[PDB]
């Protein structure tokens, strides 16, 4: 059919500042059973309707996957502002695809704290839609310059999550798949 197990059932997800991007093409995808039978925590479509995605088809489909905070799923949506929206993953105001998210406290959470996942905390300006910043270098706060090392007003841009099972649903990890939308017809 179409590689949706490779996206939704992948063993490891990428950090939000380094979200994956898989092109979906030359396949027949049955979104109807995915919506109706798969019990996700969130399935929101903005430019389309989930129950009639099959009759439409597109030149290409993109699937983006990343792990974010529990209450940080709010800003995965068009027109949203927040740490992820400005600095990690910006979504277009005219976004036409769907956003899928589910709780992953059973996989991405550790007792010692899962420092495996990072999120960009400081940046010079807001991101363009569908643009990501891989390079990490010390961020200059204030007006004094930076010698390339952390210091008083020089910060490491990437702040790590510390997922623990007792953090609460607000801070528990959430695995998010963002779908962007005639080679893929239902």
């Amino acid at each position: 059919l179409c590689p949706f197990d490779e996206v939704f059932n992948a063993t490891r997800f990428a950090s939000v500042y380094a979200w994956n991007r898989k092109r979906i093409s030359n396949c027949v995808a049955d979104y109807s059973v995915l919506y109706n039978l798969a019990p996700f925590f969130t399935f929101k479509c903005y430019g389309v309707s989930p129950t009639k995605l099959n009759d439409l088809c597109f030149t290409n489909v993109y699937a983006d996957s990343f792990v974010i905070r529990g209450d940080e799923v709010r800003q995965i949506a068009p027109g949203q502002t927040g740490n992820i929206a400005d600095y990690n993953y910006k979504l277009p105001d005219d976004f036409t695809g769907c956003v899928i998210a589910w709780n992953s406290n059973k996989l991405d959470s550790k007792v010692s704290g899962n420092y495996n996942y990072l999120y960009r905390l400081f940046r010079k300006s807001n991101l363009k839609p569908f643009e990501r910043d891989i390079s990490t270098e010390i961020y200059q706060a204030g007006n004094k310059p930076c010698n390339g090392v952390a210091g008083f007003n020089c910060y490491f841009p990437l702040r790590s999550y510390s997922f623990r099972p007792t953090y609460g649903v607000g801070h528990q990890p959430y695995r998010v798949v963002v779908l962007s939308f005639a080679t893929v017809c239902g």
Epitope: N36, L37, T42, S49, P50, D71, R74, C98, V169
Partner: antibody, heavy 128, light 113 residues
């Protein structure tokens, strides 16, 4: 869509209450909605109690999580709520509501779900 | 007590604007969660009135509107008719627990003078 609770019941203190909701117009197996229970003391504000969804994920009030217990039965379309160690202060009108997303044509999100449909409620009285 | 707080009662003359406020904590409303408004007429079950910030269900008159700003949200009624005399409840999702929670407001009693 129609939700109906069980009949009113009077209980002694320290007893265990059991309330059942029968739903119609939608299936509990649908992933887009769940069923939740809300209680309202006479002349007081509403209080959310419990929550259950399609895949048996369950949530409870933090202060009452120990006393509460909820379950569902898709074959006969009912959700059962049980409360242990009933106190006289717990007398209230118990409402049964559907946790579904209005604007359903846009999808669903369990964070933004709201009690879009409510039952008529039942009166639970706790006294000697 | 409830996590969300509302003024206990508000009053207004017919045909005049009335606003009811609702404030939250660092979680729930402060965490970006939506705010829903319900109407409870005397001797009746609550009815959904504002299903999302500034979003309105079908059948609810245009004179009802809502907004959210920071850790507070409000409900605004442009006119004031006879039937606008019920209790209005603020509601939002609270994420400060292991499985999440849903918090109601204290309820505001609206009266028409």
């Amino acid at each position: 869509v129609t939700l109906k609770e069980s009949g009113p019941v009077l209980l002694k203190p320290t007893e265990t209450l059991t309330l059942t909701c029968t739903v119609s117009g939608f299936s509990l197996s649908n992933v887009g909605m769940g069923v939740s229970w809300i209680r309202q003391p006479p002349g007081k504000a509403l209080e959310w109690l419990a929550d259950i969804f399609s895949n048996d994920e369950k949530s409870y009030s933090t202060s009452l999580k120990s006393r509460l217990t909820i379950s569902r039965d898709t074959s006969k379309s009912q959700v059962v709520l049980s409360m242990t160690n009933m106190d006289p202060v717990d007398t209230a009108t118990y409402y049964c509501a559907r946790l579904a997303n209005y604007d359903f044509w846009s999808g669903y999100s369990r964070f933004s779900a709201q009690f879009d449909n409510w039952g008529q409620g039942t009166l639970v009285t706790v006294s000697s | 007590q409830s996590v969300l707080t509302q003024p206990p009662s508000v009053s207004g003359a017919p045909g005049q604007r009335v606003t009811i406020s609702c404030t939250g904590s660092s979680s729930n409303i402060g965490a970006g969660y939506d705010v829903h408004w319900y109407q409870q007429l005397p001797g009746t079950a609550p009815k959904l009135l504002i299903y999302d910030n500034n979003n309105r269900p079908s059948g609810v008159p245009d004179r009802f509107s809502g907004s959210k700003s920071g850790t507070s949200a409000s409900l605004a009624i442009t006119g004031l008719q006879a039937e606008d005399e019920a209790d209005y409840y603020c509601q939002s999702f609270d994420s400060s627990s292991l499985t999440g929670s849903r918090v109601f407001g204290g309820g505001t009693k609206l009266t028409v003078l």
